[PDB]
Design a protein around this ligand. Structure first.
Ligand SMILES: Nc1nc2c(ncn2[C@@H]2O[C@H](COP(=O)(O)OP(=O)(O)CP(=O)(O)O)[C@@H](O)[C@H]2O)c(=O)[nH]1
Lengths: 466, 79
RNA sequence: UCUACCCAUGGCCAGGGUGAAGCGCGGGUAAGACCGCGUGGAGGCCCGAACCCACUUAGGUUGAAGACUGAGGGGAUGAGCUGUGGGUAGGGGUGAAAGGCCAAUCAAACUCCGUGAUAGCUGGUUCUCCCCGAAAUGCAUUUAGGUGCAGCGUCGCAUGUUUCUUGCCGGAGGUAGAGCUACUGGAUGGCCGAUGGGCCCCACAGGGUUACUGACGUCAGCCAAACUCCGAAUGCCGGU
RNA sequence: GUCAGGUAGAGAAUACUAAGGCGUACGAGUGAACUAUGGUUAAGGAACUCGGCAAAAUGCCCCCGUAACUUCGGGAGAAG
RNA sequence: AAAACACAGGUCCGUGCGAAGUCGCAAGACGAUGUAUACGGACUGACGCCUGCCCGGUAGCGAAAUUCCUUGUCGGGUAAGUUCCGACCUGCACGAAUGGCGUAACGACUUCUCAACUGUCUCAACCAUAGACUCGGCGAAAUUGCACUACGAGUAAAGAUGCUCGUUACGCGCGGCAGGACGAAAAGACCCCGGGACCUUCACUACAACUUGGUAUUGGUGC
RNA sequence: UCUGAUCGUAUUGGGCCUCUAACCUCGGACCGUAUAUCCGGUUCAGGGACAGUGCCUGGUGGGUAGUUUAACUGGGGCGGUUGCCUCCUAAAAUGUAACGGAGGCGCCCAAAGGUUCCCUCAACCUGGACGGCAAUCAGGUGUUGAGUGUAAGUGCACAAGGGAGCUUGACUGCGAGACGGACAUGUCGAGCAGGGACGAAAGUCGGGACUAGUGAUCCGGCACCUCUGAGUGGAAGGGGUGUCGCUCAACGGAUAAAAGGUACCCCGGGGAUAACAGGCUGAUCUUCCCCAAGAGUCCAUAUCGACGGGAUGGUUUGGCACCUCGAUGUCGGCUCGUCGCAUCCUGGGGCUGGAGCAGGUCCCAAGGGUUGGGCUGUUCGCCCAUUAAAGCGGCACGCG
RNA sequence: ACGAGAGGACCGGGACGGACGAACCUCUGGUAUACCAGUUGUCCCACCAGGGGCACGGCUGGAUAGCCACGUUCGGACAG
């Protein structure tokens, strides 16, 4: 093969564009700091950053995302080497001799989890399993494992189980049997689809008949839960109350932003995919216009297509929506990538549901914990994005003002001189309505309130002309 | 999917063969045992495999010496 | 004498169609390949009877018939179909090959004989009453639905009872129960008080400082089948 | 295996007939269902069904006229 | 009845002649009254295509006709369109330097779309004939432990005419239907066990089919 | 006849090359013979001491043949196992099964066997440069701990554990009695020869702390014997004693010698045993509650409901293997039904999370009805056009 | 009713339906094996004319009755 199909140019192919070692970012630093119960995790991880269809920063950020996923699911991540190639291998996933090199790397580390970011096909999964003798990290399976461990409600659990079964069905042969054998209780392998403890002993049922039956059952159930959620949201839909959806990337506040803009106490954890069910709550604009602020599930760069049902609630909230508060954090590697991923999912939803793109109020948080390297055009490159940093109370008033300005009012401004013999007709104006510039004269007042539509028809009583 | 077990040795039919009060002949096996659960008492020998046998004719008796159970043979009065 | 193939010698293939080279040329043309008009009548050529076959369908399916009938269907000058007379014979023949056919039977035809083959497998085994009366267990087994031995049923010996039941007496157990600070694996508390991280006094001497990871130990509390400091009841072995 | 009338017909097909030979060996009846074999069928027209299975349809002679492709022979009785 | 066999063409191997190869113990025979342009055997199965720097080097080529294609995307075809047809597709591929692609004609081959046609169907109706049915004559059959042989819910060797408790039911026919009698038929072909047979083979052991010694057979010299 | 070369006569068994006479030729001619591609004879020609066919002998040898190709098994296959030892199961004697729970094996030791004698730390301090979780060490008690050829019951400072001497209990060769356990296996008192230790002191101590560390018989060896010796003056040709040879590991060992395929199959049987259906069960499946955490814009219960819990039903996949293997016909479609309600219209309650309305979610009350097509083996589904709706199931997944 | 709209009723009262079923044959339409007519081939009735047998009732165009559906009429109810 000295000159056969000149791909094997220099021994290991792609002299420097192949597996190399420069220590990279080395991912997170998670080591033994609390000496207690070694029965914790799945050993150390090594970064192998593929630049395919991207740059070094993009690959590093993506693999850091994968390592954060792994650390949330368990495992440990404290090393970085390099590996690059502009051809996702059909047979393997890391390369011709890169597979054996990765086997040597995992043997030297003493671990069964390093990196295999990106959704794989069954061919790639089983070939890499044969090559290295142990699974390492599959991105889709790892996201599904995080969702399985974080599933709380029956709806979330059923959605995650259906997603895992949809992912398992095509790849039930090699990877399927391997993870059926696996009893260590790790990402995917006995990961379960429930939550704490979970059904690891059976996992995704690793059996064609059982998987298909369970998928059909969960599909019927998810139809039922879609109907149930339709009934639950009917009250809001019929009230026509302004609905504001907090969309954005995983982490990046969002849940914190909800708990700040309101008095809520929704789960706010530093781990990824802490919120699996969208949650709605009261909100009061500065002008008094009530609205519904809803925290949603967090998106990632390439959301697995199996989580369609898991994210259907969030997508429906986006479809209804009236402001789309887009929450991002400036304390990440190039938050514009986060912005772009969330924007692409939003645009996909808009195209699917054939609706006008609702406003998108861009908000950045964690600014207090940001490095401040950018003066006004790098840290605030966006022209009109809001900066809040929920933790230390600041900028939230500006966020509320932008919310109120962007959300178009359905009320109508009126000048009604309600007599003092009515009483109720002015008390209700105060109650359902936004009074301002009310005259103190006991004779015919002139209340310049922004009354809702039904009250706007009771003007001819004492409307006057000006 | 199978079981790694399934083996077992033959039961060695150990234990006491002549209990207290039984009249035995010299050389009669009194206890088949592993080790000295019972120790050779009076007119009782200990075999290579820890088999306690009567050294003299008489009746089997079980005693305790220094906190150790012993098998003795009490001579039987001639009729 | 069926059928497969072959050999010899005969026979049959209604009707209709299409139109394979040499003559003369308009020619092509120096000349040739070759176009066309006539002639000629080739072809495992076409349509289609007899004939041979057997694709579809319906019927038949104790049939009219142990393979057929009706309606369609294929070949129908050919590697055609056929009559007569022959040849090849069984582990052999023949096979455009399907284990197809070789007399309604073929992964080795049929008849007779060996022969009343053998079968740990099914089945059957025919009159009566009197006495007694099981087993479905153990060991072994090319053994597991078989068999050998033992166990358990059926006359004469010894026996007066050695059997068995009850009482009492002597006996070894480690089960049931618990108990675990009695061992091997666990459980809420504070404790002189382990690394002590941490404030540090500011010693790198040396020392309190421990919000928190919490040593041994200790405090009532709890479990075990392969735990036992204990430990029955029964059962068993003897004697009476 | 031989002979092979007539009229239509290309014909030894087919229909009807001459000569000749037969009515062939259970019959008589009876508008049951149902089965079989034929026949017809409004309006649809493959919606039947595994499948146009079966049926239905085209069908002959003479004039015309005949495609893709082709091994230049064909396709071809194209089709119309 | 086919896509299988055969086939014309091809390639390889064997055979120098009572050849090889076959039938035979042998003689002998076919091969063939043939003689490497011929016979036998093997495998393909008309016909056409399938060489890239050097086929002096990495070395079998990287094009194309290559459809596993699951290829998704998109369409064409249906209102819903399978077979299938196209571009985009799919990366070291991948499967064919001779086994893969084409290929007119042909096909009771498999699959599909059309036009026409229709009782295939919506959805069936009517007519005739042969049965069926009635009368006369002749006159079987498989099957059969029985019998003045119900239904329900139970029970039972776990699916009952025969048992239980009830419910129903006058006796006997005739023409029909086919739900049961675990209906008849064939001592289940499936599965297992025991045996057999035949087939395969680098299972065992043999035997048929070839070399060595000396018999037949053996003289000297140049040695 | 040696310390014993050296040449010569015949014989001699091979190898090269040769001519002819055996033998061979389906090469010619002639003859028997009128007939004759037979056959035989004669002759020539050619192989021509060249090749050949018997006997012997290695080798290749599915070309042919006879056969083998284990069993257990919650059917069979696949996988695993097969003998021995230890433990638990095992229900306090013994014994006790399962494809029950755990392990070991099947060796090793000439000084880890015998005897005689003797011992002595498991963890704190002071410490002990180095040398802390450790030294060579010293004390105390830890009270019999502790640890100790290889898993249970034992053995301890009465040492089966740890050291030392002997010189070879390395106790071997002849062994009443008793016994424990089908054969097989296992225990030892004791008597005799010879020794080993301890000796003064006694006269005392039969491989290993003990249970695994193995393989019957046959057939063969190999050493010794006061046996036999196919008429024997006699010997050579077999036995006895002790020892050897089997992963005969399928370990009671069918052969010294053996793998498969069968849907081309056949026969003898089996519902002793699988596939269908039935039956039991109900893990799975299906349909159903709560102290309700939480979601539902305000709020557990309009709608839902996690973590847990409890059942129904017998429509799934199973588990079992109880009827049926001297036959209980399968999926789908057609035809014809019949039944249940677990509701796709008709009546209500709540939500009115419709404040309201058109609508709709949820939970309580079978008479009828519940379409036609395309793609589907299609049990499933998806799609097209409708519909008031295009229900879910049982009936041998009703009905050949 | 809402009383902002968008949209838009319950309950009652009429008209016309779809599917299913029953009866019936006036209509429509199907069938029609002793009806009528046309017509091909053939053979007969001696011949012409006119008819008949056979060829699916030879074929074709109609076709009363009966039987039918695609046709007609009626039904599901109203009340207790
Ligand atoms: N310093 C800082 N930390 C913040 C800020 N906003 C959020 N965080 C932290 O980041 C973490 C992100 O978790 P969360 O707020 O739930 O983000 P999220 O988007 O809901 C995670 P998911 O989307 O998967 O549910 C929180 O633990 C929070 O403490 C901020 O403005 N500043």
């Amino acid at each position: 093969e000295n000159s056969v199909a000149p791909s094997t140019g220099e021994l290991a192919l792609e002299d420097r564009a192949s597996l190399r070692r420069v220590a990279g970012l080395s991912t997170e630093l998670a080591d033994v700091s609390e000496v207690e119960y070694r029965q914790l995790r799945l050993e150390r991880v090594v970064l192998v950053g593929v630049w395919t269809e991207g740059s070094a920063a993009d690959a590093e950020a993506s693999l850091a995302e994968l390592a954060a996923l792994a650390e949330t699911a368990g495992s440990e991540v404290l090393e970085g080497l390099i590996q690059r190639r502009d051809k996702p291998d059909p047979s393997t996933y890391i390369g011709s001799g890169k597979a054996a090199e990765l086997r040597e790397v995992v043997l030297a580390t003493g671990a069964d989890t390093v990196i295999c970011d990106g959704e794989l096909s069954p061919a790639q999964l089983n070939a890499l399993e044969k090559a290295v003798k142990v699974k390492v990290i599959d991105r889709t399976a790892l996201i599904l494992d995080i969702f399985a461990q974080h599933a709380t409600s029956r709806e979330g659990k059923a959605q995650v189980s259906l997603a895992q079964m949809e992912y398992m069905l095509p790849r039930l042969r090699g990877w399927g049997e391997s993870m059926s054998r696996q009893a260590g209780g790790r990402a995917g392998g006995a990961g379960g689809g429930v939550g704490t403890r979970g059904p690891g002993e059976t996992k995704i049922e690793t059996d064609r008949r059982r998987i298909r039956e369970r998928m059909a059952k969960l599909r019927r159930e998810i139809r039922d839960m879609k109907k149930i959620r339709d009934t639950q949201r009917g009250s809001r839909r019929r009230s026509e109350i302004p609905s504001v959806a907090i969309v954005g990337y995983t982490n990046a506040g969002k849940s914190s932003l909800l708990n700040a803009l309101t008095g809520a106490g929704v789960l706010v954890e530093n781990a990824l995919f802490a919120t699996l069910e969208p949650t709605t709550r009261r909100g009061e604009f500065e002008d008094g216009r009530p609205f519904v602020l809803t925290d949603t599930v967090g998106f990632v760069r390439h959301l697995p297509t199996q989580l369609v049902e898991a994210f259907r609630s969030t997508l429906e909230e986006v479809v209804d929506a009236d402001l789309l508060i887009h929450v991002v954090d400036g304390s990440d590697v190039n938050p514009l990538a986060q912005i772009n991923a969330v924007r692409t999912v939003i645009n996909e939803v808009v195209a699917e549901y054939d609706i006008a793109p609702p406003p998108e109020l861009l908000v950045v948080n964690k600014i207090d914990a940001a490095t401040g390297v950018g003066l006004a055009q790098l840290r605030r490159a966006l022209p009109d994005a809001v900066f809040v940093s929920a933790r230390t109370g600041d900028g939230l008033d500006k966020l509320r003002s932008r919310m109120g300005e962007l959300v178009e009012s359905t009320d109508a401004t009126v000048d009604v001189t309600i007599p003092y013999d009515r009483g109720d007709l002015v008390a209700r104006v105060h109650t359902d309505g936004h009074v301002d510039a009310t005259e103190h004269t006991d004779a015919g007042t002139r209340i310049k309130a922004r009354v809702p539509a039904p009250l706007a028809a009771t003007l001819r009583e004492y409307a006057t002309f000006a | 999917s199978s079981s790694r077990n399934g083996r077992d040795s033959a039961a060695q039919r150990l234990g006491v063969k002549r209990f207290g009060g039984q009249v035995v002949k010299a050389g009669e096996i009194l206890v088949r045992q592993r080790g000295t659960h019972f120790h050779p008492g009076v007119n009782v020998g200990r075999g290579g495999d820890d088999t306690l046998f009567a050294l003299a004719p008489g009746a089997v008796e079980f005693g305790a010496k220094r906190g150790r159970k012993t098998v003795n043979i009490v001579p039987v009065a001639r009729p």
